[PDB]
Design a protein around this ligand. Structure first.
Ligand SMILES: *Cc1cc2c(cc1C)nc1c(=O)[nH]c(=O)nc-1n2C[C@H](O)[C@H](O)[C@H](O)COP(=O)(O)OP(=O)(O)OC[C@H]1O[C@@H](n2cnc3c(N)ncnc32)[C@H](O)[C@@H]1O
Ligand SMILES: *Cc1cc2c(cc1C)nc1c(=O)[nH]c(=O)nc-1n2C[C@H](O)[C@H](O)[C@H](O)COP(=O)(O)OP(=O)(O)OC[C@H]1O[C@@H](n2cnc3c(N)ncnc32)[C@H](O)[C@@H]1O
Lengths: 577, 577, 104, 52
């Protein structure tokens, strides 16, 4: 730890790692600070679900997720407990207790919004779904040249996909996957396309998928090292970055103020380039703490001098959810090519098929798996092999169905009576809707209340916009109920529901990109540079200005790639002395 | 990966690390294998709660615990779900589903028993309570000499305490701690002694306690290294140890059969000394898989050839629990030394005390904290500082109250109205009973069903013994009810209750120690050596043959230290080159 | 607003109400026992169509009240049990117990 | 409440819910015996459980 670098990056999630990957590799002397610590093993910032124990026991992974998600803004609790002993101490009012935020209107909250403070950020636990946005969801990078805009976006996404190791083949031989995919494909022939969810992941064996994360983008090892003897990189965990220091002219950042949480020491760190990749809530926090926007409850009678649009036009996706139990029809289809003489268990119960036969509804890798299962586990009443991977099916966002869909399984906590149902029968449905950007939808920071790190307390003022957003969310719910019914019935206790606002986590627009500060009501340009500042960049979902349904990280990563191109063209690395 | 070692240890929990610390330090070439992986940061096997994020948000830590506890034996589920859609596939029977164990009588289970597979074992999440056993609970090490027995235990316990960094001073200036301590002291005066729980922990700051773990006992770094150039140690994570190979005479182990879970390869590893420290359940399973005891439902018509006591006499503590909300009388007493004039939130508000006054009920450090809190946070209705540490109180096991007590706070999930009560008010009560060892209480392993690692499925045949154990469990419940009432009334939803059997996780006696195999119905001698075998040692709670109430890990470590003494005198380390 | 959609269930011989010859109810009469499943085919297919229809229709009035989203109710909680002593024109041909005068 | 007060279940299968946090002093059977008016004839998977 010295205190002069070429580039400093705040945050070690996958957007921060994008910047590290590009600028380390191009020869800059880089330092990255994370307020969290290293805790995913020896591959720094890797996916926590890549242990053999979670590949065997995926439902336990919900606990790991919950364990690193900390609610952003909890209103004051007003539940009445009146069965306390009369000897117990009790207040007369619902006072500010337990970390709750008295600035928060409970009725204008994103109660499910949460943040993770670990090296690697949320990419240590994410679901790894990495779809591209289509034009309707996607910010413009070129005005008035739709084919140029498209070429640019194709180039950046292809790069982003290579950093993440995105692919659509990891589940190709799952029987449940193909059963669901083929059924939906048939039911929506000529109306919608289904495919595998694009997933940042690499299959290593029939029972092991290596999920991608920050570590996949950039391995986060300090450099120089044997494998990179000419690169220069230092990661400093358990360091809070508190603010950037602006010059009087508001044209340049002069330093970053940090606080080492283990030692207690404070430093001012100097760089040529400053990159904030602390997440959509914490980028905005650090910026308000640095004198951008304004602190306290906003008021249009006093608009801020710098970045008046910061923390407005915030967007969060609507999310509807359910689970189904596979239809009898679809389970019987699995064994459609099988001849079954005799009675299960006993002497010469037999199950056979004819390879190659073109009466066969199924391929022979399928039939072989089903045969071997039914022959070797004669006591089991289902034709699906016990280690068959889960479905990972999508029909992507389109104008006639403007929502993203995931028809799959991920980490989930089943009641003791959904533990009653064979897991092979269960499919999760998650449909994600787009939310229109509205100036009145805000994230702001108290001037009186502070969080666990003593920083200004984030407060939401949010409601799903009236109009198209609200009507679409209700159309999306119905579309889920209609679609799901083709695969099976609802699992009791996991019927169709809206999820808690913000629980999706895909918060956008807090520090949004546009061409022109005033006209596009934005904070950064298309290079992710903060308006008026030569040397300050922001990365993450906070940059996305549009209403989007699909999972946004690949889009944000693409915008970070473009940002790094500007950096490479405008700043010279220090000579490797 | 070479194949010849002086010593191989199976398991990297605190007991395996005890053996490593001693034997690596004595100059032996040591390999350690764990089926789990490194995932606690760069300090291998360290406590997961030592991140700044968990020191700030202690109650999220219950998630980390749950995420790494996998139930040992789950009976077949018979919950009736009858509101499935008619189109959904439904079995006609409650078949074997979702990893359930059809061998398990649900009414003779330890349903709460769970195992952890990660580097450092359960010591990556444990509560760090490390009391000694008094004579009543403690296995004899010297026969017919209680003073020599005592002297021996004291010497072993003292060394184990240094390895774990056990102390009774880390909460000495907590207001909540001393409030509860002083009150219980006063109330039971002349009848019981109260003290801080002995905790394996080091305070680093007023807001940071470094909880000990396997890492504290042995850092788990491969050697030779810069800090230890003449030592030889290798850790091999993600390796299932499957069998110890017996010679035909049943006098020596000849190799350890392993399975690398990442590469899929199987090897045989050779050592002079084989130490099993895989936990109480997994030590027994490996021995049964190696041909000790017997596979299948036990039958006294066919007692096994080797270690016929293996997996019999198993013990688990009864656990009662509640939470309380602190009494108005005690809260008011926190500020008994203060003079309060004027009105809060205004100029006129003065809180003062007289440092040193002899009529003061509390010492000056306490009064300063209280005055500062009240004066600096005049809107808060409580006199306890926001950052005051939790209570950590015990009255240790005695013949007139034969249970261990913890009066404190640990990780816990508050329902949305327990979130309603200010956390400064809340105290957790856990009392642990001793269970009499009975031959009919058994852990056995299925000859047909296999677990997630393809090993024989553990099955329990357990009921709390009639007579003294049962009588004491109920007396212990009563005593918690009576004692807790002195502090405050119960928190609704957390009234006094017995916890799920085994959820305590202090399983003992599965491979129990004694002096004579037949006479003392045991599996290992006082050096933890398996009877009849020259070179096979078992460490852990499975060795403890007594009924005990207090947390067992320190007792188990003391036994491992003794075992290491025997190894050091009977096996010669290889020359270093 | 509450929404309740009721489907029709095809009569099947295998679907039965019977009475134990050992177990007795609270009035010391033979204990009723059911042997019932929703018939495969049209009945089952219509039940799922009916769920979807409620989901589609109800959305025109408003969204679901949390906790009371679309669900099937416990079988029989409806209490419109039928066919236990069924009417038909001919005992053998119409598999019945009463004629159209409700006479046994 | 009035409706619920005058509705009696026709056929309740034998209950198999495991309660394993009883005090060790409390009496426990070793089987799921016929208890509390349950119908041992009733297959819980072929029932009209809401019939009353
Ligand atoms: C939680 C989760 C997220 C998730 C997901 C499902 C779950 C349960 N599924 C996704 C998937 O299918 N698709 C996808 O596109 N996204 C999905 N996500 C979200 C995704 O993980 C996030 O979008 C992405 O991780 C965001 O990346 P970014 O790099 O911008 O931000 P981060 O991961 O949140 O990490 C930021 C970090 O900065 C640190 N920090 C915060 N404040 C400070 C300060 N003051 N100083 C220094 N560091 C700071 C954090 O600790 C953090 O690691
Ligand atoms: C869960 C926990 C534990 C606990 C506690 C509260 C909680 C929630 N409170 C404690 C307390 O306050 N005081 C106390 O004394 N103990 C308390 N505990 C229990 C304690 O953590 C255990 O007693 C202790 O950790 C036992 O240590 P040991 O070293 O014997 O066993 P382990 O920690 O379970 O580690 C064993 C390991 O071996 C591995 N393994 C298992 N099978 C294999 C095979 N086949 N091959 C190779 N390795 C294997 C595991 O992965 C594990 O790491």
């Amino acid at each position: 730890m010295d205190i002069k670098y070429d580039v400093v990056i705040v945050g070690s999630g996958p957007i921060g790692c994008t910047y590290a990957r590009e600028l380390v590799g191009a020869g800059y002397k880089v330092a990255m600070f994370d307020i969290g610590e290293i805790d995913s093993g020896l591959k720094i910032g890797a996916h926590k679900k890549n242990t053999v124990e979670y590949q065997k026991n995926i439902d336990k992974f919900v606990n790991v997720i919950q364990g690193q998600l900390m609610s952003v803004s909890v209103p004051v609790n007003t539940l009445v407990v009146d069965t306390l002993s009369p000897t117990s101490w009790q207040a007369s009012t619902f006072f500010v207790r337990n970390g709750s935020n008295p600035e928060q209107d409970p009725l204008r909250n994103l109660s499910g919004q949460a943040v993770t403070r670990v090296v690697g950020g949320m990419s240590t636990h994410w679901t790894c779904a990495t779809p591209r946005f289509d034009r309707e969801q996607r910010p413009l990078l070129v005005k008035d040249d739709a084919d140029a805009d498209d070429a640019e976006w194709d180039r950046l996404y292809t790069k982003a996909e290579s950093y993440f190791q995105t692919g659509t083949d990891q589940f190709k031989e799952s029987i449940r996957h193909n059963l669901v995919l083929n059924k939906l494909t048939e039911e929506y022939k000529g109306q919608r396309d289904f495919q595998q969810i694009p997933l940042a992941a690499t299959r290593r064996s029939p029972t092991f998928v290596e999920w991608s994360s920050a570590n996949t983008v950039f391995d986060l090892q300090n450099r120089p090292n044997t494998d990179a003897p000419e690169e220069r990189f230092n990661l400093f965990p358990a360091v809070a970055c508190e603010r950037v220091v602006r010059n009087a002219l508001n044209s340049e950042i002069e330093s970053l103020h940090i606080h080492d949480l283990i030692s207690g020491d404070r430093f001012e760190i100097k760089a040529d380039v400053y990159v904030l990749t602390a997440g959509a809530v914490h980028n905005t926090q650090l910026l308000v703490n640095s004198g951008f926007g304004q602190l306290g409850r906003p008021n249009p009678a006093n608009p801020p001098e710098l970045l008046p649009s910061l923390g407005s036009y915030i967007t969060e996706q609507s999310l509807v959810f359910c689970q189904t139990v596979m239809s009898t029809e679809l389970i019987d289809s699995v064994k459609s090519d099988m001849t079954i003489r005799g009675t299960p268990g006993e002497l010469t119960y037999s199950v056979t098929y004819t390879p190659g036969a073109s009466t066969n509804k199924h391929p022979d890798w399928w039939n072989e798996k089903v045969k071997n299962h039914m022959m070797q586990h004669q006591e089991d009443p289902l034709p699906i092999p016990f280690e068959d991977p889960e479905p990972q099916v999508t029909t992507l966002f389109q104008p006639s169905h403007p929502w993203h869909t995931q028809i799959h399984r991920d980490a989930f906590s089943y009641g003791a009576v959904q533990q009653s149902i064979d897991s092979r029968l269960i499919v999760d449905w998650r449909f994600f809707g787009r939310t229109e950007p509205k100036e009145e939808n805000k994230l702001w920071f108290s001037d009186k209340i502070t969080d666990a790190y003593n920083m200004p307390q984030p407060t939401f003022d949010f409601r799903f916009p009236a109009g198209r957003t609200s009507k679409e969310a209700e159309d999306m719910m119905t579309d889920m109920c209609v679609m799901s019914a083709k695969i099976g019935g609802f699992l009791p206790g996991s019927g169709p529901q809206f999820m808690e606002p913000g629980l999706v986590l895909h918060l956008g627009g807090t520090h949004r990109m546009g061409f022109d500060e005033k006209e596009d009501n934005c904070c950064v340009n298309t290079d992710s540079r903060v308006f008026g500042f030569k040397n300050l960049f922001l990365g993450g979902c906070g940059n996305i200005p549009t209403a989007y349904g699909a999972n946004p990280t690949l889009t944000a990563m693409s915008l970070a790639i473009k940002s790094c191109e500007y950096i490479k063209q405008n700043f010279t690395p220090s000579p490797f002395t």
